Amino acid sequence: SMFSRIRLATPSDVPFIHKLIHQMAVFERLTHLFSATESGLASTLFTSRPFQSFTVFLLEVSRSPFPATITSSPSPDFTPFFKTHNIDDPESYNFSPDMLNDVVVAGFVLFFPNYSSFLSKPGFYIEDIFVREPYRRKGFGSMLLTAVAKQAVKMGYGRVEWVVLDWNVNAIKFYEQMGAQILQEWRVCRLTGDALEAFDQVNI
Amino acid sequence: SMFSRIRLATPSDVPFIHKLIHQMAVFERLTHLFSATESGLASTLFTSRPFQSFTVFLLEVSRSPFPATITSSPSPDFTPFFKTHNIDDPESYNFSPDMLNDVVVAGFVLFFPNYSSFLSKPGFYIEDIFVREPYRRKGFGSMLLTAVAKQAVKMGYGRVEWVVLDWNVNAIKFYEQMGAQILQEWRVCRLTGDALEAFDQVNI
């Protein structure tokens, strides 16, 4: 068996989050966009309590069972998620939160609360999901998405949202199978860089 | 002259936020979606500090000047925005935060922090902008969007994002004129309602 657990990230997890983000960039051939630092993550991701702002779930795996609970979780509204699944890991030493324990970080989901004005109810928006080698092709991306959905239900949140590439027909079918809807009318707009900085000059 | 100011909302503003959301629903012919309550807004919108989670800027107007500052703002990183502009308001009494003062709430912008993993930097996502009658056709929607952009710059945030209808050609041109980019490849996915609730049954 391979045991898996999904838990909340805390500040000590910053090195793993950093390295997972980097591996995601490498995977996507987008490393030219990577400027993330451990200091940056540490100073930005943990300014609020879980589920109140940026939240990260970490997927960990082990050849032996996980404990049934986490007593030190940074939210009273979270208990971990688990699955048992029926592999060489050269990066294991970079992904072990307790060097002596037989547990490694395998992936993450970064999400934050969004809001429906009409319902006066928060939801979650999923920004990134990434599962590192050698744990790909095992359904763990799905597991991470499912964890966010389940957390929303437990907390009475009204929606979980994310984006998908228009040509990602397999993912679109998968999302539809889950009962999600693809909203065909909307397009994302982004203001960044020098165009964003120019707003400093606007006299209000 | 008509003077305008954009400030941070606080919990006492809940009745105005409620009524603006309702007017937005009426405007859009989407009142069948409205289930917002003052209690709902009050218990959800103010669990964190401004800019750490859900944040609302309120647009107010007056025939006389506003004070130059707000000394009680709920964030040390915010000073209000102002403009002077060169009108019957039958709903004024429902929109006056100090009944005796000659100031009324005219509109709002509801936004929250999003995140760029690759930069380890927060941004803002704008969920809603609404300007009520009789203050439409005066550029105040733009002013509200500009306020969010300017706030992002002052705080060193990396991006401001929002969505636009694909057929809203005038707004798309306006966003492009501001230096924003429309990201043609992405589609929003939404999991809600019974489809979301079904995740309670998933055994992890």
From Swiss-Prot, chains A, B:
Probable protein acetyltransferase with dual specificity triggering both N-alpha-acetylation (NTA) and epsilon-lysine acetylation (KA). Belongs to the acetyltransferase family. GNAT subfamily. It is an enzyme of class 2 (transferase). InterPro entries: Acyl_CoA_acyltransferase, Diverse_Substrate_AcTransf, GNAT_dom. PROSITE patterns: GNAT. Disulfide bonds: none annotated. The keyword Acyltransferase applies. Keywords: Acyltransferase, Cytoplasm, Nucleus, Transferase. GO terms for cellular component: cytosol; nucleus. Oligomer. The lineage of its organism: Eukaryota, Viridiplantae, Streptophyta, Embryophyta, Tracheophyta. This is GCN5-related N-acetyltransferase 8. It comes from Arabidopsis thaliana (Mouse-ear cress). It is found in: Cytoplasm; Nucleus. It catalyses: an N-terminal L-alpha-aminoacyl-[protein] + acetyl-CoA = N-terminal N(alpha)-acetyl-L-alpha-aminoacyl-[protein] + CoA + H(+); L-lysyl-[protein] + acetyl-CoA = N(6)-acetyl-L-lysyl-[protein] + CoA + H(+). Its main location: cytoplasm. Acetyl-CoA binds at I129, F130, V131, R137, K138, G139, F140, G141, S142, N168, V169, N170, Y175. Its EC number is 2.3.1.48. Residues 68-203 form the N-acetyltransferase domain. The active site is at Y175. CDD domains: NAT_SF (cd04301). SUPFAM superfamilies: Acyl-CoA N-acyltransferases (Nat).
